[PDB]
Symmetry: D2
Subunit: 257 residues, 4 copies
C-alpha cells in the first residue's frame, strides 16, 4: 500500500529495467501505464498485471507522448510519477567511428524523450505534488570506454535532473535520478551476443562489481518506488544502483613512465 | 512486513534522527535495540513501542558496546543491521579556537564509535548477510563554515563506509551511509537557541534547501529502511537526505577583484 | 617557455574566457590559432599578439572546422592542444518555456562543436601526444535555476571528457575539462543587462562565491596552460575554477513542513 | 620566476612526493623549508638545492611544529604556502585486524599533523595572502580494499580542506588539496616488497590507471606549484593526480545472483 491510489507512467516498460519498475509499482499498490515502442512485452505485461495497462508510444515522437499523457489522465484521472526509462546503449563505438548525426539521434532518444515526457507531464505532477524519476547511468559520472555518445547522454540526463529539481522545488515536485551500473537485462544479453566471446564479456561485466554479480531490474524497481513514495526530502539526487562498481582500484589498462 | 523477523541496533536512538530511525524500523516489522548514553528518551521509547527495547550504552566506551552486542544476541538471537547514528555537532567554532585535543575527542565520538560497534557487530552480520548504515553529513562532502573538526569527522565516516563496503563485499555484507543536510531535531533546536537571534538562525537553516524547509527524522528513517531492506545491489553509497541543499548557486559570502 | 614550440587552437577565442586562454598560451610561448564566429575581437587579438592568428570559424559548421584544422596544420606544421571554449548560456528560461528544438540547437553549439573539432583534431594530437581541454561549467555538476537546456549541455561535456579520456589513453592523448563558475566576461555583462536590476544581479553573482568576487578569464587561462603543459598524469579530470561556489550552505529558497 | 620571493614549507619533504614538491617549488623561484622526521633525505636535499633548507620536525610533535614555523619566520621573514604532505599508508589491513588505538595513531599522523601545522601557520599566511595545500588520496573519495583506517584519514583531510577554505576565504587565504592515486615512491616500493609477489603487485598498481603507468613526484609537484602560484580563484578544490584511475569499469571482484 506504499503507493496506493497513485498513477505512474513508465517508459520503455515492456522488458528489462522498465518492466522491473512496472512490477515494483504495481506491487506497491499503484496503477501503472506501460509505455513502449514495441507491443510484444508491454502487451503481455498488461495481461499479466492487474493495475497495469499498455500504451504503444515512441518517446521520440512528440505526438505519441502527448497522447500518452492525455490518455493517462482520461483513463485514470491523475498522474503522480513519471519514470523516464526508455533509451538505448549502442554496441562499442570507437570515437573516430561515431558521427555527429548518430550522436544527435542518440541524444534524441536518451535525453530528449525524457525532456518531452517530463514537460508534458509536469502540469499534472504539480496538481498531485508528484515526482519525476529519470534513469541515467553510472557511466555518466565515471565515463566508459568505447561509448562517447552514450556517456554524454547520461551526463546530460543526470545534470538535467538537478536543474529541473531546482526549478520545480517551489511547486512541490521532486525530480531525482537512478544511475544503474551493470543490470542483467535483454539489452545486456543482446550486446554480449555481439562480442567475439559473449561468455567472457558477461563474466567481465559481473566482476566489475565488488559484489561479483550484476544487478536485477527488481532492484532498480525498488529504488524507484522508494524515490516516489518515501523520499520526500530528496530532490535532485543521483541514486547509484551499481553494486559498488565505482569503488576502489581496478584493472583500467619503469613503473612511472 | 518489509523487514519482519530482523533485528536492528540503532545508536543514539533516544531522540532526534535516531528515534525516527527506530520508529521506521519498528513500523517495518523489525525488532529494534535502542542504544543511547542518556536514559530519558530511549527508556520512554521502549515503553511506547512494542518491538523496541532500550540498552544504556555510550558508544565511546568499548565495554558498553561489547555488552550492547552480546545482549542483543542473547535476547534476540541474531543481528541484521546496525545504524551508527550517535554523534554530535558542536556550536560554531572558528578554526583558531579549536584544539587538537578537542578534535581528537570529536573523532572519538563521531568516527570511532561507528568503527567500534561495526567491528563488534560484523561477525554476526556476516552470519545473517546483514548490513551497516552509517549516518554522516552533507557537510563532509561540501564543507561548512565554522566546523573544521565536525566536517573532518563526516568526511572520515563517508570514506570509511566505502572502504568497509569493499572489504565486506565478498562476505555478502553491504555497508552504506546516509548524509543528511538540515534535519529539525533537538540538537538543531539547542544549537539555534545559543545564537543571538535563534529565529533568524532557524529561518536561514530552512532556506538553505530549495524545498524551503528542513527535513524530518522520519524521512531519514525511511531512507534507512530502504537501505536495509530493499537496496540489495547498493553498497558503499552515500544517500543524500538534504532537500537539494547541495544544488545550484546560493549566498556564500570591480566584480572580479 | 612552459609551452614553447607548441601549437594551440582556442575556439571562441575572440573575447571573454577564450581570449584569456589565448593570452595565457601566448605568454607560455605557444603559437595560438584563435577561432571565432565573429571577426571583431579575434582579428584585433591577432594584431595585438605576436604568436596568435585569427581564423573565422563557426564551430557548428563542420566545413568551417575542417578548414580550421587543415589551415592550422598547413600554416604551423603540428597541433598540440585544442581548447573547446565556444558556447553560449541563454538568459533565464523557465522549463515550460523551453522547446525541444531550442534544446537541440543549444546542444549543437555547446556539445557538438566540441565533439566535431575534437574528432578532426585527434589524428594530429595523437602524432604530437597532445591534449584536449573542454570548457564546461560548475552548473553541470550542481545544477542551476532556470537553465535546464544549458545545464544538460554542461553535464554532457563533462561526461564526454571522461569517456574520451578513457578511449585516448592508450594513444597518449589526455582529455580534461575546466568547469568555471562565475567568470566576469562580456556574456555575464550582457546577461546582467537584461535583468530588471542589473546591479543587483551582478552583486548576487559575486556573493555566490565564498571569495566574494567573480573570476577572471586570466584565471581560466592559467588553469588551461597547467592542464596542457604540466598535468601529464591528469586525464579525465574536471578542474573547478569557481571561487568555492560549490562549498557550504547558502540561500537556495513549522521548520520541517 | 612563477613563485619568486615566496617562502614554502613542505612536510615529509625528504623523499618521495614531498621531495618532488620541494624540487618543483625551488624550480619556481621559491625558498623552501623541508620538514621531515628523518634526517637522511632532507639533509642531502638541502645540500643539493640552493634555496632549500632542512629542519628536523615530526609533525605529530606539536613543539616540533611550533619551532618549524618560528624558525621559518626567523630565517626567511614570511610564509606564503604550507604543503601538508607528511603521512603514511600502512600495509594491507583486514578490518577485523585493525584496532581503535591503531586508528587513533594513524589519524594523529595523517590528519592532525596537517591540522597542527595549518593552525600555527595561518596567522602568517593571512599576512602574506598565502595558501594551504593538503595532500590527501584518491582513496578518500572512492575507497580502497584493506585500508579502512587510511581511507578514513584521507576522507577527513579532503573534507577538512573544504571547511577551512570556507573559514579562511574572508581573509584571502586559499585552502586546496591534491589527491594522488598511484605515485611511484619509496613507500610504494617498500609496500610492494612486503607482498608475496612484489613484481605482480607493482604491475597491478600500474594497470589501475588507464594511462598504464604510475605517476611521479614531479607531477604532484607541478600540481602544487599551480595551486600556490596561479590558481587564484581556486579554493576548496580536490585536484586529482591519478592517471584516470577513477574512470570507467574495472575488475573489482546466473549473472545477477
Ligand atoms: N542494463 C543496464 O546495465 C543499464 C545500465 C545503465 C542504464 N541503463 C538504461 O536503462 C534503460 C533500460 O535499459 P535495459 O537494459 O532495460 O534496456 P532494454 O533494451 O532491455 O529495454 C529497453 C526498453 O525500452 C524500450 N524503448 C526503447 N526505445 C524506446 C522508445 N523510443 N520509446 C519507447 N520505448 C522505447 C524498448 O523497446 C525496451 O522494451 C535504458 O535507457 C538504458 O540505457 C541500462
Ligand atoms: N540534525 C541534523 O541536521 C544533522 C545533519 C547531519 C548529521 N547529523 C548527525 O546525525 C546524528 C543525529 O543527529 P540529531 O540531530 O538527531 O542529534 P540529537 O543530539 O538530537 O540526538 C543524538 C542522540 O544521540 C545520543 N548520543 C550522543 N552521544 C552518544 C554516545 N556517546 N553514545 C550513545 N548515544 C549518544 C544523544 O544522547 C541523543 O539521544 C548525529 O550524529 C549528528 O551529527 C545531524
Ligand atoms: N562566463 C562564465 O561565468 C561562464 C561560466 C561557465 C561556463 N562558461 C562557458 O565558457 C565559454 C565562454 O564564456 P564567456 O563568458 O567567455 O562567453 P562570451 O560570450 O563572452 O564569449 C564567447 C565567445 O565565443 C564565440 N562563439 C560563440 N558561438 C560560437 C560559435 N558557434 N563558433 C565560434 N565561436 C563562437 C563568441 O563570438 C565569443 O567571442 C562559453 O562556452 C560559456 O558557456 C562561461
Ligand atoms: N605514493 C602514493 O601513491 C600516494 C598516494 C596517495 C597519497 N599519498 C600520501 O602522500 C604522502 C607522501 O607519500 P610518499 O609515497 O611520498 O611516502 P614516503 O614514505 O615515500 O615519504 C613520506 C615522507 O614523509 C616523512 N614523514 C613521515 N612521517 C612523518 C612525520 N611524522 N613528520 C614528518 N615527516 C614525516 C617520511 O620520513 C618521508 O620522508 C603521504 O602522506 C602518503 O600517504 C601517497
Ligand atoms: O535477458 C536477461 C534477463 O533480463 C531480465 O529483464 C529478465 O527479468 C530476466 O529473466 C532475464 O534473464
Ligand atoms: O526538537 C525539534 C524536533 O525534534 C524532532 O526529533 C521531533 O520529532 C519533533 O517533534 C521536534 O519538533
Ligand atoms: O565585460 C566584462 C569583462 O570581460 C572580460 O573578458 C574583460 O577582460 C574585462 O576587461 C571586462 O571587464
Ligand atoms: O623508489 C621509487 C622512486 O621514488 C621516487 O621518489 C624517486 O624519485 C625515484 O627515483 C624512485 O625510483
Ligand atoms: Na492489466
Ligand atoms: Na518495547
Ligand atoms: Na599575431
Ligand atoms: Na640549500
Amino acid at each position: 500500500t506504499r503507493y496506493a491510489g497513485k498513477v505512474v507512467v513508465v517508459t520503455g516498460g515492456g522488458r528489462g529495467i522498465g518492466a522491473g519498475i512496472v512490477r515494483a509499482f504495481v506491487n506497491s499498490g499503484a496503477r501503472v501505464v506501460i509505455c513502449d515502442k514495441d507491443e510484444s512485452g508491454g502487451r503481455a505485461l498488461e495481461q499479466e498485471l492487474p493495475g497495469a495497462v499498455f500504451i504503444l508510444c515512441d518517446v521520440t515522437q512528440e505526438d505519441d507522448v502527448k497522447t500518452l499523457v492525455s490518455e493517462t489522465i482520461r483513463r485514470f484521472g491523475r498522474l503522480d510519477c513519471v519514470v523516464n526509462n526508455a533509451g538505448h546503449h549502442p554496441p562499442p563505438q570507437r570515437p573516430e567511428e561515431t558521427s555527429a548525426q548518430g550522436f544527435r539521434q542518440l541524444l534524441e532518444l536518451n535525453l530528449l524523450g525524457t525532456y518531452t515526457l517530463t514537460k508534458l507531464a509536469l502540469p499534472y505532477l504539480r496538481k498531485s505534488q508528484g515526482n519525476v524519476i529519470n534513469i541515467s547511468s553510472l557511466v555518466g559520472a565515471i565515463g566508459q570506454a568505447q561509448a562517447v555518445p552514450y556517456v554524454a547522454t547520461a551526463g546530460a540526463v543526470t545534470a538535467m535532473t538537478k536543474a529541473l529539481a531546482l526549478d520545480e522545488s517551489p511547486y512541490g515536485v521532486r525530480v531525482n535520478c537512478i544511475s544503474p551500473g551493470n543490470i542483467w537485462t535483454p539489452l545486456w544479453e543482446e550486446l554480449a551476443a555481439l562480442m567475439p566471446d559473449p561468455r567472457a564479456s558477461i563474466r567481465e561485466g559481473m566482476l566489475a562489481q565488488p559484489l561479483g554479480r550484476m544487478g536485477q531490474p527488481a532492484e532498480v524497481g525498488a529504488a524507484a518506488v522508494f524515490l516516489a513514495s518515501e523520499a520526500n526530502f530528496c530532490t535532485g539526487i543521483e541514486l547509484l544502483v551499481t553494486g559498488g562498481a565505482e569503488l576502489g582500484y581496478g584493472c583500467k589498462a619503469a613503473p612511472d613512465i
